[PDB]
Amino acid sequence: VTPPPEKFNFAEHLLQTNRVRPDKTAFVDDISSLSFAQLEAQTRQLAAALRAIGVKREERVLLLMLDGTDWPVAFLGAIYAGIVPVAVNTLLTADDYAYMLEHSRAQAVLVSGALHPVLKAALTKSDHEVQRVIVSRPAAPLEPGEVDFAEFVGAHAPLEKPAATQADDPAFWLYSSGSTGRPKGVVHTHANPYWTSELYGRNTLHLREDDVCFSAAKLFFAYGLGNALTFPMTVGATTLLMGERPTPDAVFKRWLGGVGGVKPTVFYGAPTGYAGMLAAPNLPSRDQVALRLASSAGEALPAEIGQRFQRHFGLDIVDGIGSTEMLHIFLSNLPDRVRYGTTGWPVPGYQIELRGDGGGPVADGEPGDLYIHGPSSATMYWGNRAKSRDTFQGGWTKSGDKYVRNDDGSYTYAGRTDDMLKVSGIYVSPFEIEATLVQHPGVLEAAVVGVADEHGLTKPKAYVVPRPGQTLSETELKTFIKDRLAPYKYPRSTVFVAELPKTATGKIQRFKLREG
Numbered sequence: 001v002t003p004p005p006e007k008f009n010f011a012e013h014l015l016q017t018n019r020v021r022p023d024k025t026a027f028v029d030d031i032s033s034l035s036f037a038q039l040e041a042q043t044r045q046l047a048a049a050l051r052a053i054g055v056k057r058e059e060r061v062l063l064l065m066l067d068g069t070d071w072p073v074a075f076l077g078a079i080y081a082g083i084v085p086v087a088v089n090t091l092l093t094a095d096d097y098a099y100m101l102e103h104s105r106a107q108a109v110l111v112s113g114a115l116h117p118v119l120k121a122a123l124t125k126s127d128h129e130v131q132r133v134i135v136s137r138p139a140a141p142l143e144p145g146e147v148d149f150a151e152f153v154g155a156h157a158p159l160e161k162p163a164a165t166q167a168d169d170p171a172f173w174l175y176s177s178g179s180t181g182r183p184k185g186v187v188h189t190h191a192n193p194y195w196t197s198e199l200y201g202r203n204t205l206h207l208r209e210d211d212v213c214f215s216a217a218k219l220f221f222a223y224g225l226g227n228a229l230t231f232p233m234t235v236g237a238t239t240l241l242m243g244e245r246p247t248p249d250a251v252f253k254r255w256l257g258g259v260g261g262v263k264p265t266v267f268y269g270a271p272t273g274y275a276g277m278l279a280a281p282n283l284p285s286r287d288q289v290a291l292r293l294a295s296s297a298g299e300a301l302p303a304e305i306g307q308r309f310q311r312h313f314g315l316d317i318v319d320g321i322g323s324t325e326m327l328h329i330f331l332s333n334l335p336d337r338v339r340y341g342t343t344g345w346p347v348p349g350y351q352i353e354l355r356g357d358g359g360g361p362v363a364d365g366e367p368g369d370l371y372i373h374g375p376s377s378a379t380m381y382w383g384n385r386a387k388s389r390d391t392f393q394g395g396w397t398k399s400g401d402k403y404v405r406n407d408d409g410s411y412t413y414a415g416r417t418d419d420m421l422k423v424s425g426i427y428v429s430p431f432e433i434e435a436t437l438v439q440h441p442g443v444l445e446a447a448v449v450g451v452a453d454e455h456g457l458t459k460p461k462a463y464v465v466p467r468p469g470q471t472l473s474e475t476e477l478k479t480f481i482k483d484r485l486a487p488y489k490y491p492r493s494t495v496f497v498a499e500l501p502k503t504a505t506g507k508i509q510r511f512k513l514r515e516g
């Protein structure tokens with residue numbers, strides 16, 4: 001793969017790539033479609049609109065939007081202008097967004113109508129610098145000063161050329177959270193999505209022009225950003241977007257060609273979603289679908305899920321691991337070589353190392369901490385020098401994972417080096433869940449660990465010590481948390497206990513809880 005030139009604007013790159021196919025559909029969702037020509041026009045008018053309201057090169061804007069055709073216009077338009085979109089999870093709290101507003105110093109916000117109420121609460125509570133709120137598909141009357149996304153785009157002439165950025169200049173941020181503390185601003189460059197798109201999208205997956213891509217993973221996830229934006233635009237594939245929460249029925253409706261007159265040929269999703277589909281009574285038959293490739297990431301794929309998918313559809317599920325910091329997948333199975341129970345082999349372009357307790361080598365078959373050296377690494381966590389030093393260790397990026405290397409050069413997952421869980425393919429801190437449980441007046445103490453369900457997928461399990469003089473029932477605890485956590489964070493079970501195992505200093509021995 002040829003490096004990108006030093007003067008490189010990643011949006012311009014994707015637009016230039018598709019000037020050969022102006023009339024092919026770039027993106028389609030339940031209510032709208034953009035051809036590559038229409039996407040280019042609107043991308044460039046958005047870029048003009050953000051500049052017209054005073055947002056300067058290198059400043060940030062918050063992009064808080066459901067998956068839909070306005071999403072890539074917002075993302076690429078900011079980048080075309082040399083403005084830095086900060087693309088975020090749509091299922092966070094007002095408090096989380098308030099922090100992101102302040103931390104990013106965002107100058108504008110591009111927000112879906114459905115997300116406007118959470119955003120409003122964030123704006124009201126924070127010391128933010130937001131000059132304009134631009135609302136895609138408003139679901140309530142616009143407040144004074146706010147503007148509808150379609151009017152904002154349509155009122156500006158397209159910018160005539162892109163910001164003259166360099167390849168290593170910041171292009172966008174994603175946020176990632178660790179087991180405690182605030183979300184970290186992961187800073188990516190213009191070059192980074194070129195590398196992932198070339199090395200993984202093109203060279204590992206062999207995506208091509210006549211593909212139809214559909215990612216259950218939303219665009220704000222590193223995984224989905226590649227799967228449903230940077231990958232397909234690099235090869236001129238058409239992309240299906242869906243605003244709603246992925247469920248088996250929503251995914252199947254799309255697989256069968258229920259939206260936009262297109263049937264997906266490439267699907268991406270978490271192992272949990274694949275398990276859920278295979279358990280669904282109305283799982284489609286092979287002859288009803290056009291799938292040729294199935295990708296998974298977010299948590300390790302249990303072999304049985306992969307094998308049952310293969311038996312039903314005649315397609316393997318290609319499990320790979322990436323990270324927000326590496327932007328996309330660096331260790332993967334291949335479409336024509338899958339080894340279930342492993343995450344496959346290093347992606348060409350990426351070097352992997354397993355390090356032991358002192359940074360030393362590990363013999364094959366022994367677990368080590370996983371480090372990556374490759375060209376799509378983020379440069380830092382914005383404003384966090386200490387976290388940046390721990391993760392970005394001189395040309396090596398630490399992942400948080402442990403792996404074993406096998407005799408065939410494949411790698412098998414061996415757990416995390418922190419206390420994070422991956423649940424339904426999404427990070428969740430057990431300490432967050434603990435912090436929510438102990439605010440219930442009937443709870444004295446709580447400890448949360450990951451446990452494998454019947455499919456071998458990790459879910460939270462909570463051990464709870466009731467407060468002696470209070471009432472507390474499992475169904476009241478369920479109702480308490482329904483209210484306060486995202487559904488993927490729900491403990492799969494809660495066990496009421498009289499005490500927890502502890503060190504003589506009061507530290508909970510979580511390892512004993514995992515050992516039964």
Ligand SMILES: Cc1ccc(C(=O)O)cc1
Nearest residue numbers: 216246247248269270273
């Ligand atoms: C049915 C289904 C498929 C995939 C996902 C996911 O979160 O990726 C969730 C649900």
Ligand SMILES: Cc1ccccc1C(=O)O
Nearest residue numbers: 222223298321322323328
């Ligand atoms: C977290 C992540 C980001 C990009 C690509 C894949 C993954 C993964 O979850 O393994």
